[PDB]
Scaffold this active site. Structure first.
Site, PDB file in Angstrom:
ATOM      1  N   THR A 268       0.820  -1.209   0.000  1.00 15.17           N
ATOM      2  CA  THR A 268       0.000   0.000   0.000  1.00 15.17           C
ATOM      3  C   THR A 268       0.855   1.261   0.000  1.00 15.17           C
ATOM      4  OG1 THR A 268      -0.286  -0.511   2.356  1.00 15.17           O
ATOM      5  CG2 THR A 268      -2.205  -0.780   0.922  1.00 15.17           C
ATOM      6  N   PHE A 393      -6.154   4.582   7.112  1.00 10.06           N
ATOM      7  CA  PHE A 393      -5.444   3.566   7.879  1.00 10.06           C
ATOM      8  C   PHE A 393      -6.378   2.795   8.807  1.00 10.06           C
ATOM      9  CE2 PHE A 393      -2.301   6.879   6.916  1.00 10.06           C
ATOM     10  CZ  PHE A 393      -1.311   6.129   6.308  1.00 10.06           C
ATOM     11  N   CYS A 400      -4.257   0.709  11.300  1.00 14.41           N
ATOM     12  CA  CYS A 400      -2.934   0.345  10.798  1.00 14.41           C
ATOM     13  C   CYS A 400      -1.841   0.525  11.850  1.00 14.41           C
ATOM     14  CB  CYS A 400      -2.598   1.164   9.552  1.00 14.41           C
ATOM     15  SG  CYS A 400      -1.010   0.747   8.803  1.00 14.41           S
TER      16      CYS A 400
HETATM   17  C1  HEM Z   1       0.016   3.935   2.766  1.00 16.09           C
HETATM   18  C2  HEM Z   1       0.302   2.861   3.513  1.00 16.09           C
HETATM   19  C3  HEM Z   1      -0.746   2.011   4.285  1.00 16.09           C
HETATM   20  C4  HEM Z   1      -2.091   2.064   4.267  1.00 16.09           C
HETATM   21  C5  HEM Z   1      -3.001   2.997   3.437  1.00 16.09           C
HETATM   22  C6  HEM Z   1      -2.605   1.057   5.182  1.00 16.09           C
HETATM   23  C7  HEM Z   1      -3.941   0.796   5.441  1.00 16.09           C
HETATM   24  C8  HEM Z   1      -4.453  -0.037   6.419  1.00 16.09           C
HETATM   25  C9  HEM Z   1      -5.851  -0.223   6.775  1.00 16.09           C
HETATM   26  C10 HEM Z   1      -7.079   0.467   6.136  1.00 16.09           C
HETATM   27  C11 HEM Z   1      -5.909  -1.111   7.771  1.00 16.09           C
HETATM   28  C12 HEM Z   1      -7.209  -1.600   8.445  1.00 16.09           C
HETATM   29  C13 HEM Z   1      -7.596  -2.948   7.849  1.00 16.09           C
HETATM   30  C14 HEM Z   1      -8.956  -3.326   8.363  1.00 16.09           C
HETATM   31  O1  HEM Z   1      -9.451  -2.624   9.282  1.00 16.09           O
HETATM   32  O2  HEM Z   1      -9.549  -4.312   7.851  1.00 16.09           O
HETATM   33  C15 HEM Z   1      -4.554  -1.530   8.088  1.00 16.09           C
HETATM   34  C16 HEM Z   1      -4.163  -2.435   9.055  1.00 16.09           C
HETATM   35  C17 HEM Z   1      -2.904  -2.985   9.223  1.00 16.09           C
HETATM   36  N1  HEM Z   1      -1.727  -2.580   8.600  1.00 16.09           N
HETATM   37 FE1  HEM Z   1      -1.636  -1.132   7.131  1.00 16.09          FE
HETATM   38  N2  HEM Z   1      -1.525   0.410   5.747  1.00 16.09           N
HETATM   39  C18 HEM Z   1      -0.376   0.970   5.223  1.00 16.09           C
HETATM   40  C19 HEM Z   1       0.905   0.590   5.543  1.00 16.09           C
HETATM   41  C20 HEM Z   1       1.239  -0.425   6.409  1.00 16.09           C
HETATM   42  C21 HEM Z   1       2.581  -0.726   6.853  1.00 16.09           C
HETATM   43  C22 HEM Z   1       3.812   0.079   6.384  1.00 16.09           C
HETATM   44  C23 HEM Z   1       2.526  -1.777   7.689  1.00 16.09           C
HETATM   45  C24 HEM Z   1       3.666  -2.505   8.449  1.00 16.09           C
HETATM   46  C25 HEM Z   1       4.956  -2.151   8.427  1.00 16.09           C
HETATM   47  C26 HEM Z   1       1.134  -2.163   7.796  1.00 16.09           C
HETATM   48  C27 HEM Z   1       0.653  -3.201   8.560  1.00 16.09           C
HETATM   49  C28 HEM Z   1      -0.642  -3.354   8.997  1.00 16.09           C
HETATM   50  C29 HEM Z   1      -1.089  -4.347   9.946  1.00 16.09           C
HETATM   51  C30 HEM Z   1      -0.217  -5.421  10.641  1.00 16.09           C
HETATM   52  C31 HEM Z   1      -2.601  -4.100  10.092  1.00 16.09           C
HETATM   53  C32 HEM Z   1      -3.617  -4.851  10.981  1.00 16.09           C
HETATM   54  C33 HEM Z   1      -3.201  -4.728  12.445  1.00 16.09           C
HETATM   55  C34 HEM Z   1      -4.331  -5.123  13.363  1.00 16.09           C
HETATM   56  O3  HEM Z   1      -5.515  -4.980  12.965  1.00 16.09           O
HETATM   57  O4  HEM Z   1      -4.047  -5.588  14.498  1.00 16.09           O
HETATM   58  N3  HEM Z   1       0.377  -1.321   7.004  1.00 16.09           N
HETATM   59  N4  HEM Z   1      -3.699  -0.850   7.243  1.00 16.09           N
END
Ligand code: HEM
Ligand SMILES: CCCCCCCCCCCCCCCC(=O)O
Ligand code: NI
Ligand code: NI
Ligand code: NI
Ligand code: NI
Length: 460
Positions: A268, A393, A400
């Site tokens: 992403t 996020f 996130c």
């Molecule tokens: C522009 C960059 C990013 C965007 C737009 C983004 C977006 C999101 C979104 C919308 C969620 C929620 C998912 C849900 O609620 O179903 C999420 C969760 C998560 N993201 Fe990202 N993310 C980005 C970068 C990253 C990065 C850099 C990492 C790790 C180094 C990461 C790891 C995670 C993890 C492990 C979760 C779930 C954690 C949990 O619910 O306990 N993401 N992200």
């Protein structure tokens, strides 16, 4: 007041499912949301869900008291790839909180400062690749951005160098990952998913996963080599324990978290940087203002951690890129108990919701009619945002975990890009967004002219 929910075209027993017979489903749901409004019901065989577009409704949806994170049919399929990792876990699953409490320190403020020196390492490599291109060469933007973000998380999180910039074709991990993720997305369209017509799709999916786990095997084997002074994301996976339970992660769950962070921690962000640079070359005055901030603050041959957090317009530029096209375009929810949404839509327990993030960020109620335009100046004052109106996020404890990891990396790289190069829309690219659950512009190429500003590193 109780209102009835609008519903798009029904095709008999397949219900709404044939509406998504496109390789661009999210964008199709945006077309639908335009014609039906703040909310509409979507029916598929066996499954029903409700898509949300308005800040009004969605801000109620983010009430953790009333709503918990649901696993999309998408995520249930990604679960075949990532198991019960942080992304594809149920909140009620006992491996979420566990891995959450174990790994959350890896994204603390003091942790982030350790990642910077390595973020620069890969950033240097990208800059120097473009610095060494010949005159007649095009820059495949999303392809190089993928190289950048994979190596970053691979190095910061696991001390493993993919060495992407030393490769012609994408790393075999990227090839298998896209196919695997493409399967999950395309699988949502299949009445009778177990029809032997798909037995071929099931066989390649098996291969793709075999390849990805073979890479995970490399990362684990290389850490036990060692692998000593490291206190990165991998170290905490192996040695760290959950306070509440006094238990570390299993043999099995650890592998899933590795797959999870290798995917989620780059895909992403690759899209964000690609979308950001796209908008900058489509709005040169914004590009100028941003590049001028970069020239102003980035005064040392390589950026310091302090300097990256001084580039607030570059940070604004990225937020605006995340606004128009949130690379993670949707996340699901379910009502913990019976309730009524927006005071006019009754929900039963177990009912699934969908936060259509691109349509949310287009709510004229919050941003004005000025919606479709690219103006970073919307984010000059964050407190002026009726929040739950901007959630690229996600929300709650399921938001996130790598948000600060992503934005710091992206701002840094985007900053170094503006300081060292000018950019021309060499092919006059019309925006073409490829969907793989996640969003990313496709075939977007640029030309870069070097501003003749040298480098010199590298710390760590
Ligand atoms: C522009 C960059 C990013 C965007 C737009 C983004 C977006 C999101 C979104 C919308 C969620 C929620 C998912 C849900 O609620 O179903 C999420 C969760 C998560 N993201 Fe990202 N993310 C980005 C970068 C990253 C990065 C850099 C990492 C790790 C180094 C990461 C790891 C995670 C993890 C492990 C979760 C779930 C954690 C949990 O619910 O306990 N993401 N992200
Ligand atoms: C290791 C985890 C990888 C999962 C990352 C992809 C999730 C981003 C949001 C996609 C949700 C589904 C959107 C397209 C499918 C649809 O709803 O029709
Ligand atoms: Ni050309
Ligand atoms: Ni293997
Ligand atoms: Ni530690
Ligand atoms: Ni009831």
């Amino acid at each position: 007041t109780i209102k009835e929910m609008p519903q798009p075209k029904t095709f008999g027993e397949l219900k709404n499912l044939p509406l998504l017979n496109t390789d661009k489903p999210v964008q199709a749901l945006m077309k639908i949301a335009d014609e039906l409004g703040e909310i509409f019901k979507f029916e598929a065989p066996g499954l029903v869900t409700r898509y949300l577009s308005s800040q009004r409704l969605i801000k109620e949806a983010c009430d953790e008291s009333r709503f918990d994170k649901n696993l999309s049919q998408a995520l249930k399929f990604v679960r075949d790839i990532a198991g019960d990792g942080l992304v594809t876990s149920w909140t009620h699953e006992k491996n979420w909180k566990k891995a959450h409490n174990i790994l959350l320190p890896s994204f603390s403020q003091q942790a982030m400062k350790g990642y910077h020196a390595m973020m620069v390492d890969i950033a240097v490599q990208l800059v120097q690749k473009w610095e060494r291109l010949n005159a007649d060469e095009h820059i495949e933007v999303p392809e190089d951005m993928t190289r950048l973000t994979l190596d970053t998380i691979g190095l910061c999180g696991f001390n493993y160098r993919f060495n992407s910039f030393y490769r012609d074709q994408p790393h075999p991990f990227i090839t298998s990952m896209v196919r695997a993720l493409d399967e999950a997305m395309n699988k949502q369209q299949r009445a009778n998913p177990d029809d032997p017509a798909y037995d071929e799709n099931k066989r390649q999916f098996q291969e793709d996963i075999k390849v990805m786990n073979d890479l995970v095997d490399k990362i684990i084997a290389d850490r036990k080599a060692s692998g000593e002074q490291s206190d990165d994301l991998l170290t905490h996976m192996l040695n760290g324990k959950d306070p509440e339970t006094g238990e570390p992660l299993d043999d099995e769950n650890i592998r899933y978290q590795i797959i999870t962070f290798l995917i989620a921690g780059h895909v992403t962000t690759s899209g964000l940087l690609s979308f950001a640079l796209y908008f900058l070359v489509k709005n040169p005055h914004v590009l100028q203002k941003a590049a001028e901030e970069a020239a102003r603050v980035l005064v040392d041959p390589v950026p310091s951690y302090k300097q990256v957090k001084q580039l607030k317009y570059v940070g604004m530029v990225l937020n605006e890129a995340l606004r128009l096209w949130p690379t993670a375009p949707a996340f699901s929810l379910y009502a913990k108990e019976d309730t009524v949404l927006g005071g006019e839509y009754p929900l039963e327990k177990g009912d699934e919701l969908m936060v259509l993030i691109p349509q949310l960020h287009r709510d004229k109620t919050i941003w004005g009619d000025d919606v479709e335009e690219f103006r970073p100046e919307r984010f000059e004052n964050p407190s002026a945002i009726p929040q739950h109106a901007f959630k690229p996020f996600g929300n709650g404890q399921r938001a996130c975990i790598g948000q600060q990891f992503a934005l710091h990396e992206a701002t840094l790289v985007l900053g170094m890009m503006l300081k060292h190069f000018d950019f021309e829309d060499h092919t006059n690219y019309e925006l073409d967004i490829k969907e793989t659950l996640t969003l990313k512009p496709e075939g977007f190429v640029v030309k870069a002219k070097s501003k003749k500003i040298p480098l010199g590193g590298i710390p760590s």
